[PDB]
Design an enzyme around this catalytic site. Structure first.
Site, PDB file in Angstrom:
ATOM      1  N   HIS A  61       0.786  -1.238   0.000  1.00 42.82           N
ATOM      2  CA  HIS A  61       0.000   0.000   0.000  1.00 42.82           C
ATOM      3  C   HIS A  61       0.826   1.301   0.000  1.00 42.82           C
ATOM      4  O   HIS A  61       0.266   2.376   0.182  1.00 42.82           O
ATOM      5  CB  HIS A  61      -0.990  -0.024   1.172  1.00 42.82           C
ATOM      6  CG  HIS A  61      -1.728  -1.329   1.304  1.00 42.82           C
ATOM      7  ND1 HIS A  61      -2.779  -1.682   0.482  1.00 42.82           N
ATOM      8  CD2 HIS A  61      -1.541  -2.378   2.144  1.00 42.82           C
ATOM      9  CE1 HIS A  61      -3.212  -2.886   0.816  1.00 42.82           C
ATOM     10  NE2 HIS A  61      -2.477  -3.331   1.819  1.00 42.82           N
ATOM     11  N   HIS A  88       3.627   8.466   2.470  1.00 36.86           N
ATOM     12  CA  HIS A  88       2.329   8.258   3.087  1.00 36.86           C
ATOM     13  C   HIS A  88       1.427   9.387   2.697  1.00 36.86           C
ATOM     14  O   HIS A  88       1.845  10.528   2.687  1.00 36.86           O
ATOM     15  CB  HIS A  88       2.446   8.205   4.596  1.00 36.86           C
ATOM     16  CG  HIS A  88       3.332   7.111   5.064  1.00 36.86           C
ATOM     17  ND1 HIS A  88       4.187   7.257   6.126  1.00 36.86           N
ATOM     18  CD2 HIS A  88       3.572   5.884   4.551  1.00 36.86           C
ATOM     19  CE1 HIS A  88       4.871   6.141   6.287  1.00 36.86           C
ATOM     20  NE2 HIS A  88       4.532   5.300   5.333  1.00 36.86           N
ATOM     21  N   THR A 167       5.288   2.360  11.842  1.00 40.61           N
ATOM     22  CA  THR A 167       3.882   2.778  11.806  1.00 40.61           C
ATOM     23  C   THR A 167       3.031   1.796  10.984  1.00 40.61           C
ATOM     24  O   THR A 167       1.871   2.061  10.689  1.00 40.61           O
ATOM     25  CB  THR A 167       3.716   4.209  11.245  1.00 40.61           C
ATOM     26  OG1 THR A 167       4.162   4.263   9.894  1.00 40.61           O
ATOM     27  CG2 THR A 167       4.504   5.193  12.056  1.00 40.61           C
TER      28      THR A 167
HETATM   29  C1  LIG Z   1      11.754  -2.330   5.112  1.00 42.25           C
HETATM   30  C2  LIG Z   1      10.975  -1.220   5.822  1.00 42.25           C
HETATM   31  O1  LIG Z   1      11.390  -0.106   5.729  1.00 42.25           O
HETATM   32  N1  LIG Z   1       9.782  -1.521   6.572  1.00 42.25           N
HETATM   33  C3  LIG Z   1       9.001  -0.536   7.256  1.00 42.25           C
HETATM   34  N2  LIG Z   1       7.868  -0.731   7.979  1.00 42.25           N
HETATM   35  N3  LIG Z   1       7.296   0.359   8.537  1.00 42.25           N
HETATM   36  C4  LIG Z   1       7.943   1.541   8.298  1.00 42.25           C
HETATM   37  S1  LIG Z   1       7.600   3.181   8.843  1.00 42.25           S
HETATM   38  N4  LIG Z   1       6.184   3.842   8.323  1.00 42.25           N
HETATM   39  O2  LIG Z   1       7.654   3.213  10.347  1.00 42.25           O
HETATM   40  O3  LIG Z   1       8.690   3.966   8.216  1.00 42.25           O
HETATM   41  S2  LIG Z   1       9.282   1.153   7.342  1.00 42.25           S
HETATM   42 CL   LIG Z   2       5.200  11.160   8.817  1.00 41.89          CL
HETATM   43 ZN   LIG Z   3       6.361   5.155   6.894  1.00 46.01          ZN
END
Ligand SMILES: CC(=O)Nc1nnc(S(N)(=O)=O)s1
Ligand SMILES: [Cl-]
Ligand SMILES: [Zn+2]
Ligand SMILES: CC(=O)Nc1nnc(S(N)(=O)=O)s1
Ligand SMILES: [Cl-]
Ligand SMILES: [Zn+2]
Lengths: 223, 226
Positions: A61, A88, A167
Site C-alpha cells: 500500500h 504516506h 507505523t
Molecule cells: C523495510 C521497511 O522499511 N519496513 C518498514 N515498515 N514500517 C515503516 S515506517 N512507516 O515506520 O517507516 S518502514
Molecule cells: Cl510522517
Molecule cells: Zn512510513
C-alpha cells in the site's frame, strides 16, 4: 489474511488480530504515529548522494524506492544505512495537530539492526523536481534515474527526536525517529499523481496512544 | 521463582519462566541501562514534590528486595500529572549506571497514578557518613507493626540533578512505559548500614544486568525537591 488501511476486518484497529507477530501493535507502549505536541527544547551526520534506486515499486500500500546500501546517517558514533524511502498520504505524524497532505520516511538500519527513521512533510505549493525520478520510474525496471538524496532535505532543519515504532505491521519498537518541522513543497499535479498511484486510498496509520514519550526538539545542518 | 543467580531462573532466562515475562527479552526499551548519551535542557518546572514524613504501612522482604510500602499520602507531580508514592525498595548494587560508574546501593521510589502509569525515582548511596534515614527501615524490619516515620520530606536532596527517560521495571514482568528519573547526586550510607541492609536483602545481589539500549532519549535537568 492481508492487513490494510480500511475500516473493516484487516484495518489498523485490527492488525494485532491478524498475526501474533503484530500483537505489539496493540500491546506496545511506544507505538507510532503520535501527535507531537509536548516536548523539550535543547550529533547527526548525513552521507547522502544522488543514487539510482535498486528498485522503485508499490508495495504493501505504499510507494517505495529502495537503494543499494551506499547512503548513511551517522548518529552517536554509529552508521545507519538508508534502505529505502517511502511515502504516506496523508502524513502519519501530526506536529501540534497539523497534518500535511504527504510525508516521506527515510528508513535506516545500523550494524546492530537498530532502526533510525527520518520523517518530513510536504506542503502544497511549487513543483518539487526531486519527486520526478521516483514518479518517472515506477514505469521501469532497469537503469533508474538518480534520486537527489543530497538535495532532498532542507539544508537547515529543526527536528523532534523520540523513541517510537514502525507505523505499519509488525509495528516493531526500538525505532529512533527524527521528525523534521520544515515542509518540502509538492505541486498539485505531482501530489494528485503520487496520491493516485497509491490508489487514491489513504495510507495513514491513525495516531496511537502517547504515554508521555520523551521528545526533544532541536536543529541541525543536513549539508 | 525468578531470581538473580546463574542457573535456571537467572536474569538471562526470565522470558522463559513465564510468558508474561516475555517482554523481559523482547522489549526495546528495557531497564536498567548505562546512562552515557543524553541531552542537556531547561528547568521546565516539570517535576514537583509533595512529600512528607510517613510511617510505613509495612516493611518487608519480597522478591529479593527490602520494601517499605506507604499510605497514598505522598505525591510527585509531573507535567501536570500526579503520581502517588507506593513504596521504597532497594537494589545492591545500584542498577542504573551513571557514565559507567558503580554504586553499592540504590533506592527506587515507586509511584503509580490513577490510570496505573508507573513513575520510578532512583538514587544511589556511597560508603561514608551514617545515614539516619535508613535506620527506621533497618530497625523497622525486625519488627512487624508500628514502624517509625520515614522522613520522605528529607530523604532526597533539596536540589537534584536527574536523567529522565522512559524505560521498564527492572524486575519481571519488566513492564515498559515506566517513567524513570535517575538522580545523579548520591546519598550517604555507613559500612554497617550497607552491610546489614545487604543482610536484610539476604546478602544476595538483586541487580539486573544492563540491557540493550535502542537510542533511549534522555534529558538531563534539575529541580528543587523542597
Ligand atoms: C523495510 C521497511 O522499511 N519496513 C518498514 N515498515 N514500517 C515503516 S515506517 N512507516 O515506520 O517507516 S518502514
Ligand atoms: Cl510522517
Ligand atoms: Zn512510513
Ligand atoms: C509493586 C512494584 O512496585 N513492582 C515493581 N517491579 N519492579 C520495580 S523497579 N525495580 O523497576 O522499581 S517495582
Ligand atoms: Cl538505581
Ligand atoms: Zn527497583
Amino acid at each position: 489474511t492481508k492487513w490494510d488501511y480500511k475500516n473493516k476486518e484487516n484495518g489498523p484497529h485490527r492488525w494485532d488480530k491478524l498475526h501474533k507477530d503484530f500483537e505489539v501493535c496493540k500491546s506496545g507502549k511506544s507505538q507510532s504515529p503520535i501527535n507531537i505536541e509536548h516536548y523539550y527544547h535543547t550529533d547527526l551526520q548525513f552521507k547522502y548522494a544522488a543514487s539510482k534506486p535498486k528498485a522503485v515499486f508499490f508495495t504493501h500500500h505504499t510507494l517505495k524506492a529502495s537503494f543499494e546500501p551506499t547512503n548513511h546517517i551517522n548518529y552517536r558514533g554509529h552508521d545507519y544505512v538508508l534502505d529505502n524511502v517511502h511515502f504516506h498520504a496523508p502524513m502519519e505524524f501530526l506536529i501540534n495537530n497539523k497534518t500535511r497532505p504527504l510525508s516521506a520516511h527515510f528508513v535506516h538500519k545500523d550494524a546492530k539492526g537498530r532502526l533510525l527513521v527520518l520523517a518530513i512533510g510536504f506542503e502544497e505549493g511549487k513543483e518539487n523536481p526531486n519527486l520526478d525520478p521516483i514518479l518517472e520510474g515506477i514505469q521501469k525496471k532497469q537503469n533508474f534515474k538518480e534520486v537527489a538524496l543530497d538535495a532532498f532535505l532542507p539544508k537547515s532543519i529543526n527536528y523532534y527526536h523520540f523513541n517510537g515504532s514502525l507505523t505499519a505491521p509488525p509495528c516493531t519498537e526500538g525505532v529512533a525517529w527524527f521528525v523534521i518541522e520544515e515542509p518540502l513543497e509538492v505541486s498539485a499535479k505531482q501530489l494528485a499523481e503520487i496520491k493516485k498511484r497509491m490508489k487514491n486510498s489513504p495510507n495513514q496509520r491513525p495516531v496511537q496512544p502517547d504515554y508521555n514519550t520523551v521528545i526533544i526538539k532541536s536543529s541541525a545542518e543536513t549539508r
